[PDB]
Design a protein around this ligand. Structure first.
Ligand code: NA
Length: 121
């Protein structure tokens, strides 16, 4: 149906916007602390601590399968990246501090992204 096609065109346009949002968020992590999943080879106990791991590559795989239906879903995953890090790592570490910085800087990007997704519908 044409109704189905139009919904698919909306999903595709959301995906295009979320890709640009994701590039912008990832530029706020120049050290690439959040680029890849935490390795279970190098933190074997990780899954005893963190129930829902997340990272930018896993977000990008989901994005390219057009697996985000709205901004809320994408934000949930971004927040997991930050929130997992701040729980596993202590306040005085380079990791926790990189999470704080990504959060603060990412908040700006997401503030306007929420306006653009509303605005363009
Ligand atoms: Na902690």
């Amino acid at each position: 149906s044409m109704e189905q096609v139009a919904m698919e065109l909306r999903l595709t346009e959301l995906t295009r916007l979320l890709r640009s949002v994701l590039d912008q968020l990832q530029d706020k992590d120049p050290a690439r602390i959040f680029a890849q999943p935490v390795s279970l080879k190098e933190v074997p106990d990780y899954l005893d601590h963190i129930k829902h791991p997340m990272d930018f590559a896993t977000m990008r795989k989901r994005l390219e399968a057009q697996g985000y239906k709205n901004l809320h879903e994408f934000e949930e995953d971004f927040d997991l990246i930050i929130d997992n890090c701040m729980k596993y790592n202590a306040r005085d570490t380079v990791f926790y501090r990189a999470a704080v910085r990504l959060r603060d800087q990412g908040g700006v990007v997401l503030r306007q992204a929420r306006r653009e997704v509303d605005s363009i519908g």
